C-alpha cells in the first residue's frame, strides 16, 4: 500500500501547522451578543414536508420543493406563490434557483435532475432538459450558470453537466458512501462535497479529481457551505457538531459543539459577513453559532418539526428556514 | 400608485388561481395512500381497492445502504416489508433491517406490514440441507406451535411451526420497544399481487382509524 508513511507525513504536516489556532486568537474579540430573531413572515401553503429550498439572486423570490410533488416559488416581500410546478416524481430531495432566474432545477429520488424553464415565451412552465445518468438518488444540485449544473448523487459521485446537451461533462468520483450536501465557491471554480463518510472533499470543476480531502467529523455529513471569503467552509454532520475547515490550512480550525445537543445538524449556512453561522438541527431549532468564538448566540425555535433546509439571502437581509411541517419561515 | 397596483393585482390574481389549483390538488393528495416496498437487505405502481388510490413506491434503483434515503418515507402511511423465509442467511439480515426500521428516530411513527414470501419454498428448504432453519436458529429446535391458532389446511405441522416461529420472532422484535404510532401487521403469502391488495387495504384502513383515534386521544 505504501500510504501509511504518507498518512504519517500528512498528519505531521497538519500537526506542525496546528499552533496558535483561532480558538485562542479570538479571545480578545468582543462577543456579538444575544441576537433577537423574529419570524417576519410564514410562507404556509405546502402540503407535504418541505424538504429543500434555495434563494434567488434578487433576494426576493425563493424556491421551495416539498415531498407532495410540488415546487413553489414564493415572493417573500409580498408572500405570493408566483409559480406552482407539478412534479412528475413526488419524492424530491433538492432544488436550486438559477442565478439569472431563468431556470429552476429539481432533483429527487427518481435519480433524475429536471430543469424547469420559468419565463420562456409561453406563459406556462415546462421542462427544458431532463438530465439522467446517475444511478443513486440526487441529494443536492446547484446552478453554476444557465449553461452548466453541478449535482451530487447517492452513488458516491458528483456530475457536472451541460444542460443544452444533457451529457456528463465531468464526473467527480472518489467518495465513499452517499453524498449528501453540495456547495459552490464564489468564484464557481472549486466546490466542496460532503458524503456519508465523515469526509469533505474539495474538487475542481475544470479537472475532475479530488483536489483536497478534509476529515475531522465522526459520522455522516449532512450539510456544507463555503465561507463568503471562499478560503474556508463549514460542515454540519450527524455528530451533533459543526466544524469550520480551511482550504489553505488543510485541517480543522474550530468545532461548534455543545453539551446538551444530542441532535445531528441537518442544514448549515453562513451570513453575509460570515460572522454568524446558522445551523438547523434535528431538535426542531436553528442555532446561530458565533463563527469566531464558537459560542451559541441565538435560537430560532419557530418550527414544530425538524428543519430540512436553511437559506440566507445574497444581500444578507433575511434568513429563510424550511421544516418538515410544510411551513417555511422568514427571520430577520 | 396605480403603476404598481396594476402588477400587484396581477400577482394577486396569479396567487388566487395558484391557491385554487393547490386546493384542488390537496383533495386528491390527502385521498391517496402512499406506500413503500422493500425486500430483504419500475419505480411506482398505482392501483385502487374499494375506490381508494394506493401509490406503492418500489425502490430498488438505489444502492444497498439505506440510512439516508429511507427517512423520506417517514410520512408513508404503511411500509410494506417482504421477507424471503427460504434463507444464505437472508432471514437474519431481514430481521436486523426490520429492527433498524422499527427503532428508527424518524420511522418510529410509521406502521409496518410484513409479507413472509417464499412460503412454499421453505417446505423443501427445511429438508434440502443447504440452509437449515433448525441449524441457523437452534432455539427453533425446542420451539413448538405457540398457541392453538388454526393454520391453513393441507400442510405439514413442521412448515407451519417454522412460519409461526418466524412470525413470533418478528413480533418479538417489534414489541420490544413500542413508542409511537408504529404497529406491525404480519401476514402469510406465497405470491404478491394476488389477493394481497385486500389485506394491504384492510391494514391501511386500520392504521388510519388508529391514527384518528390517537388524534382524539381515545386510544
Amino acid at each position, epitope marked *: 500500500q505504501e500510504a501509511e508513511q504518507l498518512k504519517n507525513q500528512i498528519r505531521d504536516a497538519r500537526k506542525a501547522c496546528a499552533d496558535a489556532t483561532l480558538s485562542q486568537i479570538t479571545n480578545n474579540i468582543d462577543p456579538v451578543g444575544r441576537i433577537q430573531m423574529r419570524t417576519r413572515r410564514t410562507l404556509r401553503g405546502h402540503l407535504a414536508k418541505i424538504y429543500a429550498m434555495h434563494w434567488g439572486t434578487d433576494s426576493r423570490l425563493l424556491v421551495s420543493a416539498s415531498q407532495d410533488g410540488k415546487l413553489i416559488i414564493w415572493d417573500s416581500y409580498t408572500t405570493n406563490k408566483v409559480h406552482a410546478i407539478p412534479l412528475r416524481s413526488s419524492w424530491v430531495m433538492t432544488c436550486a434557483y438559477a442565478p439569472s432566474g431563468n431556470y429552476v432545477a429539481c432533483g429527487g429520488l427518481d435519480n433524475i435532475c429536471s430543469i424547469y424553464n420559468l419565463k420562456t415565451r409561453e406563459g406556462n412552465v415546462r421542462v427544458s432538459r431532463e438530465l439522467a445518468g446517475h444511478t443513486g438518488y440526487l441529494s443536492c444540485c446547484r446552478f453554476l450558470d444557465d449553461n452548466q449544473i453541478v449535482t451530487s448523487s447517492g452513488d458516491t459521485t458528483c456530475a457536472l453537466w451541460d444542460i443544452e446537451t444533457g451529457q456528463q461533462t465531468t464526473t467527480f468520483t472518489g467518495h465513499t458512501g452517499d453524498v449528501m450536501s453540495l456547495s459552490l465557491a464564489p468564484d464557481t471554480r472549486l466546490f466542496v462535497s460532503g458524503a456519508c*463518510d465523515a469526509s469533505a472533499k474539495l474538487w475542481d470543476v475544470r479537472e475532475g479529481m479530488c483536489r483536497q480531502t478534509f476529515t475531522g467529523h465522526e459520522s455522516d455529513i449532512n450539510a456544507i457551505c463555503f465561507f463568503p471569503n471562499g478560503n474556508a467552509f463549514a460542515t454540519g454532520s450527524d455528530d451533533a457538531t459543526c466544524r469550520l475547515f480551511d482550504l489553505r490550512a488543510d485541517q480543522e480550525l474550530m468545532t461548534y459543539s455543545h453539551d446538551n445537543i444530542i441532535c445531528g445538524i441537518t442544514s448549515v449556512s453562513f451570513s453575509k459577513s460570515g460572522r454568524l453561522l446558522l445551523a438547523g438541527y434535528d431538535d426542531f431549532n436553528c442555532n446561530v453559532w458565533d463563527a469566531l468564538k464558537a459560542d451559541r448566540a441565538g435560537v430560532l425555535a419557530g418550527h414544530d418539526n425538524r428543519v430540512s433546509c436553511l437559506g440566507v439571502t445574497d444581500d444578507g437581509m433575511a434568513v429563510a428556514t424550511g421544516s418538515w411541517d410544510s411551513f417555511l419561515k422568514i427571520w430577520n | 400608485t396605480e403603476d404598481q397596483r396594476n402588477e400587484e393585482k396581477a400577482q394577486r390574481e396569479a396567487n388566487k388561481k395558484i391557491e385554487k389549483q393547490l386546493q384542488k390538488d390537496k383533495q386528491v393528495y390527502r385521498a391517496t395512500h402512499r406506500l413503500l416496498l422493500l425486500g430483504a*437487505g419500475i419505480f411506482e405502481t398505482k392501483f385502487q381497492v374499494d375506490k381508494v388510490n394506493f401509490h406503492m413506491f418500489d425502490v430498488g434503483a438505489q444502492r*444497498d445502504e439505506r440510512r439516508k434515503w429511507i427517512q423520506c418515507f417517514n410520512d408513508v402511511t404503511a411500509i410494506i416489508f417482504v421477507v424471503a423465509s427460504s434463507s444464505t442467511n437472508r432471514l437474519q439480515a431481514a430481521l436486523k433491517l426490520f429492527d433498524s426500521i422499527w427503532n*428508527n428516530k424518524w420511522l418510529r411513527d410509521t406502521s409496518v406490514i410484513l409479507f413472509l414470501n417464499k412460503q412454499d419454498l421453505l417446505a423443501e428448504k427445511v429438508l434440502a440441507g443447504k440452509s437449515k432453519i433448525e441449524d441457523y436458529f437452534p432455539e427453533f429446535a425446542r420451539y413448538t406451535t405457540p398457541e392453538d391458532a388454526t393454520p391453513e389446511p393441507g400442510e405439514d405441522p413442521r412448515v407451519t411451526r417454522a412460519k409461526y416461529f418466524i412470525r413470533d420472532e418478528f413480533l418479538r422484535i417489534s414489541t420490544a*420497544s413500542g413508542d409511537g404510532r408504529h404497529y406491525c401487521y404480519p401476514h402469510f403469502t406465497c405470491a404478491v399481487d394476488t389477493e394481497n391488495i385486500r389485506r394491504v387495504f384492510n391494514d391501511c384502513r386500520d392504521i388510519i382509524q388508529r391514527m384518528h383515534l390517537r388524534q382524539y386521544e381515545l386510544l
Partner: nanobody, 128 residues
Framework: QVQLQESGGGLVQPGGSLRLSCAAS????????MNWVRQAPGKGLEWVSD????????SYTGSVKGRFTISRDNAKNTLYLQMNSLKPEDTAVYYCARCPAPFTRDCFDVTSTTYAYRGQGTQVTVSS
C-alpha cells in the same frame, strides 16, 4: 479520522478458542453501538453480534449464540470478542463495525459496499 484497527485471528484448530481485539480511534467510543460482521469465502457479509454503548442489550446471531461473547472497555476504548468451540464453517473474515448513529439504537451496517465505518477486518481459519 474514523479508524478501526483489528488484531488477533489466525489459524486455530477446530473446537479451540480465539480472541479478537478492535481498537477504535477518532471518535467517542462510549457513544456508539458496536457490531461484528463476518464474511465467509464466496458468501455475503452477515451480522454476528451487537453490543450497546455500555452494554445492556447484547445480541448474537442464532448460529453462534452461546459460543461467542462480546465485551467493550470504554476507558481503554476497545472491543473484545471471545470465540469458543470453533467450527470449520466459522472460518471467515471478521470486521468490527461502528454503525453511525450516536445515542440511538438504529443503524444499518451490513452492506457489502464501501462502508465507511467498518475496519479492514482480520482472517480466522479452522484447520483439520
Amino acid at each position: 479520522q474514523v479508524q478501526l484497527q483489528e488484531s488477533g485471528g489466525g489459524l486455530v484448530q477446530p473446537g479451540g478458542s480465539l480472541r479478537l481485539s478492535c481498537a477504535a480511534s477518532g471518535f467517542t467510543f462510549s457513544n456508539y453501538k458496536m457490531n461484528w460482521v463476518r464474511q465467509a469465502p464466496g458468501k455475503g457479509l452477515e451480522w454476528v453480534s451487537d453490543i450497546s454503548q455500555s452494554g445492556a442489550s447484547i445480541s448474537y446471531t442464532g448460529s453462534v449464540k452461546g459460543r461467542f461473547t462480546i465485551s467493550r472497555d470504554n476507558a481503554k476504548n476497545t472491543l473484545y470478542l471471545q470465540m469458543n468451540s470453533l467450527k470449520p464453517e466459522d472460518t471467515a473474515v471478521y470486521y468490527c463495525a461502528r454503525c453511525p448513529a450516536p445515542f440511538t439504537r438504529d443503524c444499518f451496517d451490513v452492506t457489502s459496499t464501501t462502508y465507511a465505518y467498518r475496519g479492514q477486518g482480520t482472517q480466522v481459519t479452522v484447520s483439520s
